[PDB]
């Protein structure tokens, strides 16, 4: 996250970090005790993945961390149907053992298609993660978070040559300097509705980071909540 600030322990208890062939390479959000939702470009199979909930400072021990193994990965069925479009950038990870919910490990709320969109339209969400704090720069040790304003789709489209599908939305500032960045992918774009946070987006892509005239591109969660609920049922 570029231009954000440190989060406080327990401020985003639904946030998890993913580790694999590369350490802290992407983020994710707790759907429930056995499932995490992330970005599909983060988990192109062919590698083992570990999830850490209750994480705050990557290099220290807080005694709130819960590490779990990923036994199943389900990328959206239409992800990569076309090459390099980043459309449908979302995936689910099933855990080997269930997380123990507590103050530092809490699920993010997910409304129906109707209300997820309504909440997105409030126009102000929070993004967080351990990704790069500077374009092409180093990554964060302490979790970062940034409030980002929704960008009108019409201006969103005119800001890039690439295609912004109906499964995406732009968020960021016209002046630049503040943005999510490489390494934050899969992490949540959330909307706080009177003290309760709902997942409204998935950090997905961009053109460089924090560049004036450019905005962060996010997966529009409202278009995928039926699918999420359908695949993460507990028995």
């Amino acid at each position: 996250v570029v231009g954000g600030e440190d989060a406080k322990p327990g401020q985003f208890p639904w946030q998890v970090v993913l580790n694999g062939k590369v350490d802290a390479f992407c983020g994710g959000s707790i759907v429930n005790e056995k499932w995490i939702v992330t970005a599909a470009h983060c988990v192109e199979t062919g590698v083992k993945i570990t999830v850490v909930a209750g994480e705050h400072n990557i290099e220290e021990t807080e005694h709130t961390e819960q590490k779990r193994n990923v036994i199943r990965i389900i990328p959206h069925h239409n992800y990569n149907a076309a090459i390099n479009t980043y459309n449908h950038d979302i995936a689910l990870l099933e855990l080997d053992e269930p997380l123990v919910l507590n103050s530092y490990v809490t699920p993010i709320c997910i409304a129906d298609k109707e209300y997820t969109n309504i909440f997105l339209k409030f126009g102000s969400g929070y993004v967080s993660g351990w990704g790069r704090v500077f374009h092409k720069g180093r990554s964060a040790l302490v979790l970062q978070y940034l409030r980002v304003p929704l960008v009108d789709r019409a201006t969103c489209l005119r800001s890039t040559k690439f295609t912004i599908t109906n499964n995406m939305f732009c968020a960021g500032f016209h002046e630049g300097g503040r943005d999510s960045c490489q390494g934050d992918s899969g992490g949540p774009h959330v909307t706080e509705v009177e003290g309760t946070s709902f997942l409204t987006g998935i950090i997905s892509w961009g053109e460089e980071c924090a560049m004036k005239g450019k905005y962060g591109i996010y997966t529009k969660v409202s278009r995928y909540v039926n699918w999420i609920k359908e695949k993460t049922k507990l028995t």
């Binding site: 322990p9 208890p13 919910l101 699920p107 709320c109 997910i110 309760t196 946070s197």
Partner: protein
């Protein structure tokens, strides 16, 4: 109605008969007494911060 202020529902609103309004909440929550606000029904309901907001305090 749900027309203005989400029909005075803390989370979800849906139009009822005679232009009435029925409020609802997400999982882990229960509809309060006032029929509009939502209250935790489980130990750790989704979407909420439960660590003493910036350092511990007393009320």
């Amino acid at each position: 109605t749900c027309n203005i202020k989400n029909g005075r529902c803390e989370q979800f609103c849906k139009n009822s008969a005679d232009n009435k309004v029925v409020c609802s909440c997400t999982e882990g929550y229960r509809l309060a007494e006032n029929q509009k606000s939502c209250e935790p029904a489980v130990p750790f309901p989704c979407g909420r911060v439960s660590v003493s907001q910036t350092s511990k305090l007393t009320r």
